Design a protein around this ligand. Sequence first.
Ligand code: CL
Ligand code: CL
Lengths: 359, 356
Amino acid sequence: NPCEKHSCIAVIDAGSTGSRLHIYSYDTDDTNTPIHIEEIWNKKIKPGFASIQPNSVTIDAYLTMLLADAPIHNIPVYFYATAGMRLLPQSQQKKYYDELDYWFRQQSQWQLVEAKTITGNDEALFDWLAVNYKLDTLKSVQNKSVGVMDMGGASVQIVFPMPKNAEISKHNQVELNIYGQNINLYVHSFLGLGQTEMSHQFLNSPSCFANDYPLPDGESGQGNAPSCKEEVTSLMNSVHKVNQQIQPLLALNPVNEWYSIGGISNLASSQLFHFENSELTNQSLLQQGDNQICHQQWDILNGQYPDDEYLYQYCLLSSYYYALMVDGYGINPNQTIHYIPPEQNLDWTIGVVLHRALE
Amino acid sequence: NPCEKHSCIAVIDAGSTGSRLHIYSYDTDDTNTPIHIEEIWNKKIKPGFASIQPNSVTIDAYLTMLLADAPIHNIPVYFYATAGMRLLPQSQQKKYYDELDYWFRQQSQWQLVEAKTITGNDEALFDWLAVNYKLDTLKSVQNKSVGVMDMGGASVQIVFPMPKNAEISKHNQVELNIYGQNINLYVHSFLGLGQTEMSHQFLNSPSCFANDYPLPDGESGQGNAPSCKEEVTSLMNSVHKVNQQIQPLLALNPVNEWYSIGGISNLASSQLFHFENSELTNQSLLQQGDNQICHQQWDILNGQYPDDEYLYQYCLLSSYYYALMVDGYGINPNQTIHYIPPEQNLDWTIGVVLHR
Ligand SMILES: [Cl-]
Ligand SMILES: [Cl-]
C-alpha cells in the first residue's frame, strides 16, 4: 500500500457515459507541486451519473458500485462531473449533489473534498495539465506553445498558451503557478459540439453514414466524408461561430504543437485506420474515413468489425473531427496532430492532482 | 371496470423524455372503427426509455413502475417508441426490445401486440389523427385545411393536407381512409429539432437567457430574443434545411387552422405568458418572451416566480418556437396558432386507437 508512504487522492471523472474513479499516489517537490504521480486504481461504471434517477436508493447503489473493490480506502475524494451534468437545469443538478453529499457523510472511509459540476473551462485547464504532465513540459519554461484538444462524448475543449488579455472574458483565461513558473492559458469548451450532441443533428444525413446504413427516417446511408464534413461545418460555424471565436486567437497566439485526447485517439488507432507515431493529419483522417468507411457497404463493414460499438458513426466522426479542427479552429489540414495512444486511455484527471482550485 | 362493456386498448407513447401509458375504452361504428374513445387511465414516468441502462433489472423496474399499478391489465398493449429510440442504432434498440418482450412474456395479463420504434412519418400521422379526433373534424369532409404541429423533446412533427405528389418522397405522404372519407396528408418529422435536443446547442449562448442567468461555462445571460431566434434559425435552415423542405409545400397547400401539441402548450399556458382561448401568434410569443424573460434580471425574475423549474428556459424556448414556425415552416408571424390545453396531456396515442 503506497498510500502509507505517499500522498494519495481519488478523482472521479463523472462524464456522460459513465463515472471513472482513479486513485493517484504522488510526492510533492520544494515548490510544493505534485511529482511522481502514479495511478494505482482505475475503475469505470455505467451509466453516466446525470442519467440516473436523483434519489437516495439509486445514488447510494451507484456510489457503492463505483467505490466497491477499491484496494485503498481512507483517502480524499474529488467528484467532478462534466458536460453530462452541465446539460441539466441547475435545480436538477442540486438534487444529485444533495443526495451524493449525504451518502458520503454517513460513511467514514472516503473523505469527500468536493462534489460538483466543473465548467468546460476548468475541464480544458485539466486537459492541458494532464497532457503536459505526461510530456514532462511543466517543470521548465517552454520555448514552444503546446495546444491541447479534448474530443469528448458530451463536450469538446481547446486550450493553448495566451498572455493575460483585458479584451477576452476572464472565464476563458487561466493563470497558474506550477513548479515555480507562471503559465497563462486560453481555455474554451463547447457542449453542442460534443460527439453526442453533434451526432443528434446529423443522424438523417446520408453523406455521414456508410452506404445502405439504415437512417432513422427510413432512407439509406451514401457515405461521402467531404459532403458530411461540409454539413457539420454549418453547425461549427453558422450556428456556433467557432471560426470567429477561435481563429483570431490562434493567429495572434500561434501553437507550435497539437496534442489530442478523447474519441479521436480511439478512432485513429482503430484497425480501419493507418497512422504511425501516434499522430495524424486532418487531410489523411478525412481521406481514410471516406475510403475505409463512408464508401463501404454497411452490412459488409458491420460483419467485418462486430462488437465495435461506435463503428456506425466512423464516417461521421472522421468528417466531424475535420470540420472542428480545420474549418472551426483553422488548423492546417496537413499539420501534424499528436494523439495520446488509446491504451493509456488518458482523461483530464491527472490535472486535478496538479491543481486543486476551480473557477 | 369500463372494459367489461367496451373495447379497450393500452397505448404507450415512449418518447424521449418519458413514457406515457394511456388506457382507452371505445365502441365502434359499422366499419369497426373506434368511436366514443375515452381515456380511463393515464400514467407518465421519467426518464425516456431509451435513456435507461439496457439491462434486465433496469428495464423490468421501469416497465413495472409504468404498468404495475394500472387498474386494468388483460387488454392489448401497443408500446410505440419515438425519437428517443431513433437516436440509437438498431443493435442498441434491439437490446431494449428483447428485455421488454421478456418482461411481457412474464406478466400474462397484458397482451403485448407490438413493441417497436415507429417512424417519424407514422408518428406525424398519429399526431394529425389524435388532434382531429379531439376537434371532431373526422366525421365529415372539412372545407378547411387543418395542420398539426407536435413540439416534442427530441423530434418535431408537421402534418397537413396535401394531394398525392410525385415530387415528394412517399416516405413524406400518406393516404388514409377514416369514417369513410379519404385524406391525403403530407407528414414530416425533424430529428434533433425537439426542444431538449435543440437546447443542447444553445446553453452557453448569452442571447438565449435572462440577464445575469449563470450559464454552464460561467458567463452571464444577456437575453435578446431576436439574436437567440437567429441562432436557432441557423440550426433550422443552415443545418437542417427546414425552410427549403417545408415552405414551398405550405405555399401550395395553405393551412387555414394550425393546431399544436407538446411543449408549446406548456410554455404558452404558463403564468409568464398571457394568451386567451388557448391560442397565440408567433409575433406575440416572441415579443412576450423577449420583454418578460430575455430582458429581465434573472435573480429578480426567479424570486418573482418561484414555482417553476423551466422558467429559466423561456427566453430560449420563445425564440425557438418562433424560429421553427416562422423561419422554418414559413408561418405568418401574425397567424393564430391553437395549442391544446396542457391539462389534456394530449399526445398522438389516440391516433393508434384509430389507425393500426
Ligand atoms: Cl427520423
Ligand atoms: Cl459548458
